[PDB]
Amino acid sequence: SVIYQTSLMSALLSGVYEGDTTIADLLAHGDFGLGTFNELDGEMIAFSSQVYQLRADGSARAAKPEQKTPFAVMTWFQPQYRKTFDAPVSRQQIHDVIDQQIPSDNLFCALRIDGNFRHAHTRTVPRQTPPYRAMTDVLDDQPVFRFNQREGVLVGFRTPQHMQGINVAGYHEHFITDDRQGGGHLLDYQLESGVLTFGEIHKLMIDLP
Amino acid sequence: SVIYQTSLMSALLSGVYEGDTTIADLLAHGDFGLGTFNELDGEMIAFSSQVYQLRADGSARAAKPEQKTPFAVMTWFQPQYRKTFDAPVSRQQIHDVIDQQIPSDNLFCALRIDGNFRHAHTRTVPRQTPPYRAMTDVLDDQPVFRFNQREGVLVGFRTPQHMQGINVAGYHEHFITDDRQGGGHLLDYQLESGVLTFGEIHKLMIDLPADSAFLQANLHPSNLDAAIRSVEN
Ligand SMILES: [Cl-]
Ligand SMILES: [Cl-]
Ligand SMILES: [Zn+2]
Ligand SMILES: [Zn+2]
């Protein structure tokens, strides 16, 4: 049970938008994860060994193995816990449940939700052309996508505070709809109903750029 | 070709001085490295899959496979570069040489020197008793040993600056004498003559402990870099 990542989140935010790790490589390190693609071309989400690309123009595609990534986090998902939510529940309330069960911040968590989302807000980063700006300074218009009563899959990690530059500290969740056509990096959501699985991980492996 | 480490420098700093990783475990992840031992009992140096414990009372001994460590760094040493020195050369100049060859700071380096050290100072951390205090708050004297015109072995890593809590950022080097009876954690040194070998590494593997002291520790203290620098230099 091992968190694998390609490159550093510090390195990404710095404008290092290309890397030589392939989707082929990713799937050798996990069946489960998230990240982005070279040239910052969309959001990556992965589960059950399926890897999807979520792009600005709302389109979506299964990823090609040869496609490359400048940042991704993978594991072999092995949840320890199941929660059934039969009434609406906020993203933060979800996190309160997991935080209460796995209170140490010095571990990783991985978590999946299958369910109906009452509300979901994503961003999906647009493809960038060189020379690369810092991500906080993407001059390109990038909208907040909104989903209401949409069935979908959520994939996420909770990363220790003290690893802020290495990975995304705290909760980092990606989302894709049932039809596998929309989603992205989640900014907030409310679950109408669904099934949560999660667990702790305490091994970290980094391929450096 | 992988940097293996058990726990984090962060954790050791905060006072988590007991781990469950054994020396035998370490040796399954490399033939080369450095660290400390449970209860902060001294310095560990490892090379040619030989492991030594340098203690605060000046004793040196082969480590036992079943001894535990709260923090250690290992790899299978596969140097790509080699430079010999026939004239003296400072610790910084050594680092300058490696930096010229491996300028990327996204990479780790492992380095070994075999030779005659004109000068060296080493520290060895003193064994602690619970309740453990943080390293910036240790009450015991921390002995410094001096070596002049001594043959020996230097083992070291270069860690990317942006990984300062995970590991010891920058250069971290340990030392033992030819007769394996003195050394420890290097503070300064000057090589009289000898042979440098080193190489680049771009994979890092961290085992996080699951014991209670580790799980409760604060690993993002205020001025992390300054704190670690006050302890490692
Ligand atoms: Cl992302
Ligand atoms: Cl050390
Ligand atoms: Zn994201
Ligand atoms: Zn040391």
From Swiss-Prot, chain A:
BP GO terms, sorted: acetoin biosynthetic process
Reaction(s) catalysed (UniProt annotation): (2S)-2-acetolactate + H(+) = (R)-acetoin + CO2
Pathway: Polyol metabolism; (R,R)-butane-2,3-diol biosynthesis; (R,R)-butane-2,3-diol from pyruvate: step 2/3
Keyword tags: Acetoin biosynthesis, Decarboxylase, Lyase
GO MF, one example: acetolactate decarboxylase activity
E.C. no: 4.1.1.5
Top EC class, one word: lyase
The organism's place on the tree of life at top rank: Bacteria
Presence of keyword Lyase: yes
Protein purpose: Converts acetolactate into acetoin, which can be excreted by the cells. This may be a mechanism for controlling the internal pH of cells in the stationary stage.
Protein family according to the UniProt entry: Belongs to the alpha-acetolactate decarboxylase family.
Designated name of the protein: Alpha-acetolactate decarboxylase
Taxonomic placement: Bacteria, Pseudomonadati, Pseudomonadota, Gammaproteobacteria, Enterobacterales
